[PDB]
Design a protein around this ligand. Structure first.
Ligand SMILES: *[C@@H]1O[C@H](CO)[C@@H](O[C@@H]2O[C@H](CO)[C@@H](O[C@@H]3O[C@H](CO)[C@@H](O)[C@H](O)[C@@H]3O)[C@H](O)[C@H]2NC(C)=O)[C@H](O)[C@H]1NC(C)=O
Ligand SMILES: *[C@@H]1O[C@H](CO)[C@@H](O[C@@H]2O[C@H](CO)[C@@H](O[C@@H]3O[C@H](CO)[C@@H](O)[C@H](O)[C@@H]3O)[C@H](O)[C@H]2NC(C)=O)[C@H](O)[C@H]1NC(C)=O
Ligand SMILES: *[C@@H]1O[C@H](CO)[C@@H](O[C@@H]2O[C@H](CO)[C@@H](O)[C@H](O)[C@H]2NC(C)=O)[C@H](O)[C@H]1NC(C)=O
Ligand SMILES: *[C@@H]1O[C@H](CO)[C@@H](O[C@@H]2O[C@H](CO)[C@@H](O)[C@H](O)[C@H]2NC(C)=O)[C@H](O)[C@H]1NC(C)=O
Ligand SMILES: *[C@@H]1O[C@H](CO)[C@@H](O[C@@H]2O[C@H](CO)[C@@H](O)[C@H](O)[C@H]2NC(C)=O)[C@H](O)[C@H]1NC(C)=O
Ligand SMILES: *[C@@H]1O[C@H](CO)[C@@H](O)[C@H](O)[C@H]1NC(C)=O
Ligand SMILES: *[C@@H]1O[C@H](CO)[C@@H](O)[C@H](O)[C@H]1NC(C)=O
Ligand SMILES: *[C@@H]1O[C@H](CO)[C@@H](O)[C@H](O)[C@H]1NC(C)=O
Ligand SMILES: *[C@@H]1O[C@H](CO)[C@@H](O)[C@H](O)[C@H]1NC(C)=O
Ligand SMILES: *[C@@H]1O[C@H](CO)[C@@H](O)[C@H](O)[C@H]1NC(C)=O
Ligand SMILES: *[C@@H]1O[C@H](CO)[C@@H](O)[C@H](O)[C@H]1NC(C)=O
Lengths: 901, 901
């Protein structure tokens, strides 16, 4: 509306300079059984424009009336404050509005004093609490998660990323609990005069930083410390039982070297004297990059060599690299507004791989970046209801809209765009431009224009030849949604580009200033030999680099560097298939995965027959590398979802049973009857994939093997005969093939689980049961925070709807209890989006579409929040599915039968 | 409305005397691929009241215009009929309306001739077609189903049970195809003058009989003939393959003696020269009682000693007895209108047991009457949406309502009421009154008052002392809904009665003139000794017969002869339980089944605790008789329906696994490791129940046993080692435990089955699969007439909704395609009533109730037809289930646990 307090965007009238925040958490429930933290705040601000009102962010904060009002106002340096008329708390916009009897003076400094109290709830937002068990005693830890808009919950502030200020933090805690914040404590802790049982810890002044990178923790966690080569002291904090077991050894091994590697790589030293990585039992997101105090989930930080798998090790190292990369991209240089979220996340989501590559040079995770980032986002970027990488700031106001931006789009598409940009700009020029950008905008806010300008300066300095300026090349990739599909006519060597859409009849409603045309850098190979690069500027082009004679074949997007899909004519497709059947090693592994994924996704978008996509998997019977198998399984996951409840699931499983039986058998010889694991990480991943694929599709040998392993474990509960890498999948199969007794054993083991990794494995496996009543009981369990933690609630439900039997249960449960689910659990976090996506991803029928439409209509008043666009996407996808199966069911079935023999 | 042709009931102005029907079926498709029949019929009728219009029944008939009109009127005995003004066909009331320019003369005879064409469709209604395969040759049979209001489909007629007439049937059939009707042919056949390839068979004039009993069958079936003792030729007709293998020998053995027994018992000789019993490949109901030509479903008549089970044999003898009893009750004496349908079906259901007991004296089938008739109908009779035994004639107008009356109420409650009547009148007086009633109203319609008058005459003649007249005693049971529950206070001996309702809240909209007060004949036993009979004519009474001192216990309703429930004080219930623990044999077997069933139904009525009802099943660990085990399993079926998708199913099965494990073991010793069967039928049934209960609740030895038997059959498809009594349970359990291979093998045997009994066993078993896609494929098959016959469609779907996995499947299928089912199978061979009852019996949540209400709201315009009232009942039951589960779930779950160990 016209009123200032009714607008979600903060007025640019006042600019904060420094805050003083004192916080006193109570870790013992009061007379009402409520955990309450009381605090005092003092915020100093400069008055840029004359105004009669002060608007600051305040969420769920009860203010103690002092001097007759909620807030006290004072001047600085002779400035006089006008008398306060009134104070009001506006819930819809979450704002503390202080109406004054006069007007402030321009270019003057004032201080604003507040006394407040709030709830130390278990919502994993703002200043919250996390509970764990030591022996038979409860322990409560007060921690923070101010991501997006939660800093307003802890204390009154100008909660916007562009409002940078220096914070003076003070924590009043129990005498026996250590207090941790962004900076090192200033002096030693002193007892509170009111009660000697309370300690007062005052920390140093933090540098110019945004309000969402603050962290206040009080806990008895212990730490393992080591001094990095760049003079930064790295400490790993966790529960005493976890640290005493050495679970933080790997994190301490990898944290320091990665930080020093980033500092040397970008020539920008880490400006903080210390870095504390602390694992929290309860944590919403994967991790948070608070400056100086990086908080993790316990599964992403702690690693037990005897019980954690190689996938857990990769997860730990990649998350550590991601959070340490956010130190430069997100903390030193922050976004002007969330709409440019890809500047932070995306950047980290790229360079995390670099960090991992330094920590584990023998793993080659940069190859896995293609499957984890590019083809992950390409699934949702092909929808007509997607959003550009840099949405205009006008469309993104509410906290829920801000939360939705944390989707696969930002992270994965930013990582893929930066990967393509570094590929065509070389790593040297890219990192030189990034270093110049980092030095120029330290402790400041940025937009994509500044990044393009600095990259253009680096290009000019290094004399790099590009068709146009960097800004014009990258505006095609940043300012419009989607990616181009590239059709190659090898008869004439003609290139055509067009906007790729999963549903050709879908109506794109978002206009693009470039009319959905991209300047595409093209890398091609001919008969396995690399060719000279090309630049597709126009809609259609002709060149002899893409013309074939005789048996020559050409492949575009070598190693999948560019962010685009590639389609060929039937001649070149047949040549590629012949090459694959003859000697598939002549094509790069990444290119084989690209071929499989691209064929399947083109078939889903009606560009090529589905028969071609299924034909491209006929060479898997002699393929041993992890990447093509993983790409094929991910592509066939769509078929599994589409036909798991139809007559096609019979032959299709058989077809898979034909393709995977050799690989399985091979690993039986390679692993020496499953007592050893392969040395290479790729081989371990492929072995797990082979076991799972052969074992879900009905190869009797794996069923007997997993049953024997689980019964052997059940005989000796303390000694686990299953190797950690093989644990998860075996568990799942052993619960699917077993009965009530196996489920009860697994549940009892999960209750006693001491490591979060084993607990997660068992929780994921418990949803694999094939009994309806067991699934119903499990679904009832997921809503009980005593049994299953709230952070793991929605995820668990997802596993339940991954089971074919539990799909209907989860859909009915969601339809019945959406009103309740919205209030808690997902709400406006980043989970609801996932639950909606997972529960509606099997819809292929007009009846299911009508059910989804009724679900949307019935919950208009309650709203969807962060799950809005995903729901929209679901609807679109459902329509596509209805048009797909009806067109492609029968033939697909036929094909599977013809190849099931 | 005011228009006569808009009223469903026929006018009383015209009364038919005789019909002459000539029918010519075309058993090959015409130029339009349609099976048609051409007919011509004349009707002689008397004009009781002067009318200017002739309203007759006509359905799906195309009339050739003769003399410018659809029909031609001629005078009889000098009468001069007025000329035809116009002829119209009103579809909603199915009337051919002939308007005349004048008015007919009162007490005058006229003749109406018509030539018509109809379709020989496969709807199993009217004149329809049944197709089978002999080798590779397709054979088509023209048969009839004229029950209810389907006699108008074949030829125009005054289609009402009160409009009796004499029929002259002529059938024009092919040269080599035999023709059969109600009467013997009137001389030998003659070739058709038009085409010598057609024969014209004219039959003798049928006696005064209702229109819905006509049968016209053209087929090449073969027969086995035998002359009964009463000089009536019994001929069993079936397909050549069935007769050649002697599948009709048992029917020949039992049919003649049962007819002779009925004739001797009721002193009324069979008034027709021959009785034909013909088995048809396609038939809606179990059988139909057409006078002289009794049509049966292949399973209700054919019996193979090698492959069929004793249950199949019992069905054959019973169905035969049911139809042979219908001959006296329904053909000789007919109901005035469908609202009094219990005079036909109730009497037939009661006398079928007498006939079967005569044919098979050692089976003791009469006891099963308690389980199959009384306790089956009490469940639907304890509802607020029930209907009385004798519904007012004004409430039954449309054909749909008539079909709805063919429900559990008419059949089973009539059987139970006549059982009580024979109980307190003694069999001698009962059969004397029945003989008088048959003699007086031969070839005439009747109402219940005539039956009461003749029974009162018999009572007065035999000097039987009753509290009041038979009319007043029996109008309580006939004209008002429901049954009473008698509460007994044994400390003082007080008896009270009240209208039994499963839901105390349920409101009874329909009023009762007697205010739901019954005159109850009560029989009691004290410590196993019979006491004097008592008559409860008031709501509350006191008598020392029902007062106990010390450990004395009293049971009411000995051998459940009366149609009422019994409740006791907690003391007497404990005394009964203690007896059952000490020596269960001291209580009669039927009374033990009564105890279990009444306790469970009172617990469901919130009159006694659920723990009591569950306690009464504790003695089953030492119970070997069939009736208590069957009653307990039937009662626990409701618990299984309520809790099979919840946490309670876990313990419940275990408790059953505890109870049935000894019995199963016992039979293993009795049957010598399952190579033999017990001599007694009841013991055979109990063995089947023990095997099924052990395998269903996860008793291992049963699982390995059934798996091994089915695997052995799989090795040798020709040699089936499973005994016919065990085949159904073995097939279902093996398909449940097995996988795709077992289901595929079973399907092949089903599509290559020769005996209907084997096909039914396999069709029932195929729905026991636990895989979702297999269930979807089977559900898709059920709608294909080529794979599963239409007559078996609904039942098969019901089987799928009996599977716990398939419940949501069938619910979604019904919700999506109600219109398709109510159109393609609309008003045809689809039993919507049974389908709704089966699909909606698991509903116990508010979300499911809302879904049911939305289902009702969506299809109001299309209507539910004969499944209307059942739908209402479902709704009522659904709400009652919600309350029962909410209050009993916790106590029930605990009880099972504390008794599962
Ligand atoms: C949070 O801490 C910062 C850093 O201590 C505070 O800024 C400091 O505020 C004090 C206020 O007295 C300043 O002291 C002044 O120094 C000038 C020096 O010329 C002197 O003329 C004045 O009389 C006065 O003593 C101090 O300079 C300033 N900065 C530093 C580096 O200490 C800030 O006010 C705190 N924010 C709060 C309380 O919200
Ligand atoms: C219909 O009734 C007839 C006669 O009541 C049944 O025929 C009888 O069948 C039994 C069983 O096969 C025969 O017993 C056998 O007799 C032979 C000697 O002939 C003996 O070697 C066998 O060990 C056995 O005891 C009985 O003789 C036979 N009677 C006649 C007159 O044929 C027939 O089985 C019934 N059909 C049914 C039940 O479907
Ligand atoms: C809470 O405050 C007390 C009192 O200051 C701290 O106890 C002192 O810890 C220092 C650590 O070097 C010792 O030298 C002193 O002797 C201790 N006692 C006193 C009276 O000073 C205590 O460590 C604080 N707890 C924290 C920081 O968690
Ligand atoms: C962290 O790094 C240290 C040193 O690189 C690792 O310690 C080595 O572990 C290997 C394997 O157990 C031994 O063979 C070496 O002798 C160890 N070296 C020293 C100096 O102790 C340690 O295992 C690493 N922690 C991890 C990977 O969790
Ligand atoms: C159709 O009618 C003809 C004529 O009556 C039947 O043919 C006679 O059949 C009898 C046996 O039923 C023979 O003894 C005669 O010699 C036949 N004569 C003639 C003139 O055909 C014929 O059998 C009938 N077909 C039936 C009843 O299916
Ligand atoms: C703040 O006040 C509201 C309303 O009085 C109350 O519901 C809430 O519990 C208070 N907050 C705390 C932390 O007590
Ligand atoms: C797939 O391969 C088969 C041979 O296995 C071939 O006949 C068919 O044409 C191929 N389909 C396409 C689309 O190339
Ligand atoms: C719980 O798990 C722990 C694992 O450390 C084990 O030592 C303990 O015996 C378990 N207790 C029970 C009751 O299962
Ligand atoms: C009767 O007439 C209607 C309308 O012409 C036609 O659709 C139907 O097929 C006819 N029935 C027969 C058996 O000829
Ligand atoms: C019953 O009627 C029969 C038939 O006439 C008669 O013989 C008999 O005496 C009657 N019984 C009486 C009147 O008690
Ligand atoms: C059922 O039996 C248990 C003991 O087996 C007893 O405690 C309970 O009271 C009984 N139920 C009733 C209703 O008496």
């Amino acid at each position: 509306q016209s009123k200032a307090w009714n607008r979600y965007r903060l007025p640019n009238t006042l600019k904060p300079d420094s805050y003083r925040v004192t916080l006193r958490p109570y870790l013992t429930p009061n007379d009402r059984g409520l955990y309450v933290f009381k605090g005092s705040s003092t915020v100093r601000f400069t008055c840029k424009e004359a105004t009669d009102v002060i608007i600051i962010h305040s969420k769920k904060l009860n203010y103690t009336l002092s001097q007759g009002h909620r807030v006290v106002l004072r001047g600085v340096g002779g400035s006089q404050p006008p008398d306060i008329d009134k104070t009001e708390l506006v819930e819809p916009t979450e704002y503390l509005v202080v109406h004054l009897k006069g007007s402030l003076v321009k270019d003057s400094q004032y201080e604003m004093d507040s006394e407040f109290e709030g709830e130390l709830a278990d919502d994993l937002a703002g200043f919250y609490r996390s509970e764990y068990m030591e022996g038979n005693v409860r322990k409560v830890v007060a921690t923070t998660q101010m991501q997006a808009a939660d800093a307003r919950k802890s204390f009154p502030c100008f909660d916007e990323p562009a409002m940078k200020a220096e914070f003076n933090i003070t924590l009043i805690h129990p005498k026996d609990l250590t207090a941790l914040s962004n900076m090192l404590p200033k002096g030693p802790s002193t007892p509170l005069p009111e009660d000697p049982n309370w300690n007062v810890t005052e920390f140093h002044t933090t540098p110019k930083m945004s309000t969402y990178l603050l962290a206040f923790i009080v806990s008895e966690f212990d730490y393992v410390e080591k001094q990095a080569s760049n003079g930064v002291l790295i400490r790993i904090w966790a529960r005493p039982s976890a640290i005493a077991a050495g679970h933080g050894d790997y994190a301490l091994n990898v944290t320091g070297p990665i930080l020093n590697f980033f500092a040397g790589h970008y020539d920008t030293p880490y400006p903080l004297p210390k870095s504390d990585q602390i694992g929290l039992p309860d944590f919403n997101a994967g991790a948070m990059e608070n400056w100086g105090l990086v908080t993790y989930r316990e599964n992403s930080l702690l690693f037990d060599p005897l019980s954690s798998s190689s996938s857990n090790k990769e997860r730990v190292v990649t998350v550590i690299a991601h959070e340490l990369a956010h130190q430069w991209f997100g903390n030193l240089v922050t976004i002007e507004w969330w709409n440019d979220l890809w500047l932070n996340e995306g950047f980290a989501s790229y360079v995390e791989y670099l960090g991992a590559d330094y920590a584990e040079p023998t793993w080659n995770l940069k190859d896995l970046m293609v499957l984890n980032d590019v083809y992950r986002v390409m699934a949702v970027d092909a929808l007509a209801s997607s959003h550009p990488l840099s949405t205009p700031a006008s469309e993104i106001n509410t906290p829920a809209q801000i939360s939705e931006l944390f989707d696969a789009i930002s992270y994965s598409k930013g990582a893929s765009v930066l990967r393509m940009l570094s590929s065509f700009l070389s790593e040297d020029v890219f990192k030189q431009g990034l270093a110049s950008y980092l030095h120029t905008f330290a402790y400041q806010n940025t937009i994509y224009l500044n990044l393009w300008d600095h990259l253009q300066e680096a290009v000019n300095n290094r004399s790099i030849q590009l068709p146009t300026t960097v800004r014009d090349i990258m505006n095609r990739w940043t300012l419009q949604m989607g990616f181009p599909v590239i059709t190659v006519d090898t008869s004439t060597g003609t290139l055509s580009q067009e906007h790729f859409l999963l549903d050709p009849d879908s109506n794109v409603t978002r206009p693009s200033e470039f009319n959905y045309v991209w300047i595409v850098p093209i890398t091609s190979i001919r008969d396995g030999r690399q060719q000279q690069d090309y630049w597709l500027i126009d809609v259609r082009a002709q060149n002899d680099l893409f013309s074939t004679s005789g048996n020559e074949w050409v492949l575009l997007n070598l190693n999948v560097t560019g962010y685009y899909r590639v389609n060929y004519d039937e001649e070149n497709w047949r040549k590629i298939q012949t090459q694959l059947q003859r000697d598939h090693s002549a094509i790069p592994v990444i290119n084989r995965a690209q071929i499989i994924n691209d064929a399947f996704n083109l078939a889903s978008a009606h560009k090529v027959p589905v028969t071609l996509a299924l034909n491209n998997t006929l060479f898997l019977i002699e393929e041993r590398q992890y990447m093509p198998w993983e790409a094929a399984l991910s592509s066939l996951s769509y078929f599994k979802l589409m036909f798991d409840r139809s007559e096609v699931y019979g032959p299709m499983k058989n077809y898979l049973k034909k393709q995977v039986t050799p690989l399985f058998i091979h690993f039986r010889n390679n692993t020496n009857n499953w007592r050893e694991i392969p040395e290479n990480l790729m081989d371990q991943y492929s072995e797990v994939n082979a076991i799972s694929t052969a074992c879900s599709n009905g190869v009797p040998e794996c069923e007997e093997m997993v049953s024997g392993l689980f019964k052997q474990w059940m005989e000796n509960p303390n000694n686990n005969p299953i190797h950690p890498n093989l644990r998860s999948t075996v568990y799942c199969n052993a619960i699917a093939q077993g009965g009530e007794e196996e489920w009860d054993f697994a549940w009892e083991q999960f209750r006693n689980a001491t490591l979060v990794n084993e607990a997660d494995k068992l929780r994921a496996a418990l949803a694999c049961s094939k009994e309806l009543w067991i699934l119903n009981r499990y679904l009832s369990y997921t809503l009980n925070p005593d049994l299953i933690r709230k952070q793991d609630a929605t995820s668990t439900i997802i596993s339940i709807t991954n089971n074919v039997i539990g799909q209907g249960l989860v859909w009915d449960f969601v339809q019945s209890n959406w009103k309740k689910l919205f209030n808690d659990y997902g709400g406006g976090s980043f989970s609801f989006s996932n639950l909606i996506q997972a529960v509606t991803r099997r819809f292929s029928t007009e009846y299911e579409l009508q059910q989804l439409e009724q679900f949307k209509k019935d919950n208009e008043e309650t709203g969807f929040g962060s799950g809005t666009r995903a729901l929209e996407q679901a609807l679109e996808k459902t329509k596509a599915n209805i048009k797909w199966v009806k067109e492609n069911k029968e033939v697909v079935l036929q094909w599977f039968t013809e190849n099931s023999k």
